[PDB]
Amino acid sequence: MKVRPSVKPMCEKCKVIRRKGKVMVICENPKHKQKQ
Amino acid sequence: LVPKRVKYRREFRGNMRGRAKGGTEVAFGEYGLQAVEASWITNRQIEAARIAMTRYMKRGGKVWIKIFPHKSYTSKPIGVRMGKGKGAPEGWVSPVKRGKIMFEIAGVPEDVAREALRLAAHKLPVKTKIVKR
Amino acid sequence: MIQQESRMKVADNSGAREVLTIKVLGGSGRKTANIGDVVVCTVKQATPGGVVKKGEVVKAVIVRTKSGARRQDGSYIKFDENACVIIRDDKSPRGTRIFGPVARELRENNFMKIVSLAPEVL
Amino acid sequence: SRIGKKTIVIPAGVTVTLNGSTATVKGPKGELVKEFNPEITINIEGNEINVSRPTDNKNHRALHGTTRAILNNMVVGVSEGYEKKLELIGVGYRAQKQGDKLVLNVGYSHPVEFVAPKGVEIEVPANTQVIVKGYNKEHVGELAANIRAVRPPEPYKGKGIRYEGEHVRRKEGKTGK
Amino acid sequence: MEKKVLIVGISQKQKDFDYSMEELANLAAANNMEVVGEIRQNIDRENRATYVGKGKVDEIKGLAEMQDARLIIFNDELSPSQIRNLEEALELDVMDRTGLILAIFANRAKTKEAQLQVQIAKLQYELPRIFGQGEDMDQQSGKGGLSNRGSGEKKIETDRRTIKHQIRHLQKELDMLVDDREVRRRKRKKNEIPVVSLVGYTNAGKSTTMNGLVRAYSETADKQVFEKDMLFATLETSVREIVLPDNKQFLLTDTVGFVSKLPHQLVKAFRSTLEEARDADLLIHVVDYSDPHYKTMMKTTEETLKVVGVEDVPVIYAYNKADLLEDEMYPKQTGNTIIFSAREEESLEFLTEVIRKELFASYEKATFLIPFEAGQVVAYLNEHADILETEYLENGTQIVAEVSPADLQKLAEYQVAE
RNA sequence: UAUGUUAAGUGGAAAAGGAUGUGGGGUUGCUUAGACAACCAGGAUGUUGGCUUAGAAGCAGCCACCAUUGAAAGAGUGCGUA
RNA sequence: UGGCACCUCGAUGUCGGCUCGUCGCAUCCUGGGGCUGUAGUCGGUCCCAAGGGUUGGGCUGUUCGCCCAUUAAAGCGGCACG
Ligand SMILES: Nc1nc2c(ncn2[C@@H]2O[C@H](COP(=O)(O)OP(=O)(O)CP(=O)(O)O)[C@@H](O)[C@H]2O)c(=O)[nH]1
Ligand SMILES: [K+]
Ligand SMILES: [Mg+2]
Ligand SMILES: [Mg+2]
């Protein structure tokens, strides 16, 4: 996981979702997992 | 960007009240960066923004810089007290009021222009927007 | 009870004769060592022409102490001197001969060659 | 809610009753009972169940949809049932059972033991194949997930316990040269 | 603008003393400065107080005030007392060779590794000099007496402690950066790719050689390395793949150049930087054969390699600039020496042939029989080894090729005895 | 009291930046001659287009991107093989 | 590291050590986890976590530092530099 203030997509399969009131990115590539 | 010569080596800092006097419209190119707030902008910041936005376009099109650093500012070193005259000049600055267009570009399509201006605006201490003629 | 700065007489064939202890191994705040413990140490006197030289940093096992050991059946043993044997990274001696009596506790700690080379195992 | 508006056709042999907000479903395979919020309402007749939506705002829409889905799954599970399937990949990876106790040899120094709860059963067609069966979606899914979490698949050889409907992301151990 | 400077030197029993002043002028011309006059003195020993003696100071001051200079540059490292004395006598600004090299390095440091290295070198250089520099304020004579309230220390202790502290912080950041750097070498070390490193003097032609080799034998050949005459052009190391026509792979590295009379505070930075050359598998020493002084350069080159700590590595001495010389034939190999011109296809072919001969010498003949339906191994052979001939048999494919011991062990089942 | 907004205890502390939170407006595309989402079926032939390569069969890379039946069907969107 | 001169000049004892600690977390060890240029071994980086633990000497008045030998580890700061 990457914990940054600037979560945004890194490729064209990344998806931006919200869980428990946090913005995050999920993807097939595990290197693209981000949480704000 | 430094003036070749000046009449005086020291100058008041001034203020930034009001909307920009002139230069609030795109006049040479198709695209421009507009200031939304007021700020002092140094020549290092101008140079960094220019290099970023010029490198993205691969030396295609044309770029106009619409602000010049006419004013100088001074400083005092660490360990000196107050008094004993004014300090020594350090750098050159341009006071930019809200509404001023400070960079213009032409000769490239929408995408290249907008992305170059976005890359440039991240080097500047002021809040900006992108406008088209 | 051997702690740092205590000196011991060397009871084997190597060139050393007297040794000063530098560190008791086996824990951060450990202070004293007993029969069957390994110490780091330095050679203070040596026999000219031997394998171990003066000023060398070595490690050794204590084979008899002046405050000895108690056995589980309720008996005790004590000696008139403190003595050590210079050893390698494994538990093997660096000499070919061992002098004086050695305590039986060396066998429980698996110092087999020292036990077999001794004149007497008490 | 398109889901919330759909009709539930009751199969033969299963009976559904309402005690206030509580709902009870019976049939050939078992009995279910569950509590929903009173703001939604349900009609009852011979062979149709309809859940209605008083209001059009957000949470109310979501609750309508999920209430319909839960009723559908409950009735189907009572009537036909539910199952999940599990595979083991790797040398020496073995699945067995002694009575009502699943025993897994998945590469540890000890075997791993599982016992099913009430309403759920475990079946072992082959030494490298497991099946979880029951009339409750949540419990079957939870037990299959718990079994799979013992030794999840790994990307360098594919070894572990996985669903049949899993695609494992595969990596190469040595690259660059 | 451009500053006017002077350069001052003593014979000091140096063997040349002329190339030293020439390269000092070149270095000054590489710092946006121009030399408007040099002073030399043939004294066999250095003066203890002013480095040139009493009369030479007046002569230097007169020349500076006639040529209108702003700074004086001395050919050797100065002493803090020497600096104080010269500054008081000349009423100008004084700077030495170490300061000049540090100034050159500071403004060409882009990556923060170089920036931090130059920062620590500058602070280490200025740390001993602050004594008399700060004593002028500190030696105020009148300060007080016994006070029953105070710091319990003298000001000299306090300022010594303050200046000592920050050095440790900067060095700590350096160490953390180098440790992070060792992470990126994990893949290279885990595999066993041979590595060959280019070393030599400045402006020898290392970067041009690397660029030619990369254009000849790389997949992403568009990745070029900067080249120019100027001065210390490359301040960073680069690593690239090279794949030979006979299907062999190695890595080529490029490092920085150095010059004679090198500061000791910066040789630590070079020792940090040349850590890739230290663990190299082969060394290529580029020498500018055209320059008459090239011989001297070679010696000082080994000296640098003796200090950073690279030894017992096979070295091939390559003499560049063969085209610039008349009545010479190239490329040619003599012992462990190569005569060639970097900007030549044939010279690069010869150099890569020499490299292949030197590195790979355990690739021997072997024959394999790969069954048809159990295929997918001929592809490995063709993309990991050089073949000679293959045959289409009824039972499979009969290949013969020259391979490495690892391939032999991996393909031990397919070997056929004769 | 009337009409709205907010779900953070914001209210009751702090920026550049980041974001399918939520409400109100204004434009525009398709749609009961059936739109969007799922489900069923098809998704073909010259032809493995040419070059290069030991290969390259849509899917290492370069140059081309036509035609037929037909409702459409890419000289191929991605995975996969060597 | 500095700037200012707001309390104290009918007195607010000032460095290092010893004795005795207590608190913060921006975590040195130990506990849980995500990513890896994670095959294994050994590591790197980030998230949760302050329960407990966190060495003896040579030199120097020294704090700091260098060195010797250990340890799971030899944390960084506040408390009138406690
Ligand atoms: N006539 C001739 N000129 C050459 C030859 N090889 C290189 N040169 C010239 O010498 C120069 C070499 O510069 P370069 O290789 O960048 O020097 P460098 O070794 O990188 C200096 P640094 O150590 O700072 O990187 C080039 O500009 C090129 O024009 C050659 O074979 N013949
Ligand atoms: K901005
Ligand atoms: Mg004793
Ligand atoms: Mg003693």
Ligand SMILES: [Mg+2]
């Ligand atoms: Mg005095």
Ligand SMILES: [Mg+2]
């Ligand atoms: Mg910002």
Ligand SMILES: [Mg+2]
């Ligand atoms: Mg909004």
Ligand SMILES: [Mg+2]
């Ligand atoms: Mg559809």
Ligand SMILES: [Mg+2]
């Ligand atoms: Mg008073």
Ligand SMILES: [Mg+2]
């Ligand atoms: Mg001491």
Ligand SMILES: [Mg+2]
């Ligand atoms: Mg340890």
Ligand SMILES: [Mg+2]
């Ligand atoms: Mg404190």
Ligand SMILES: [Zn+2]
């Ligand atoms: Zn992605």
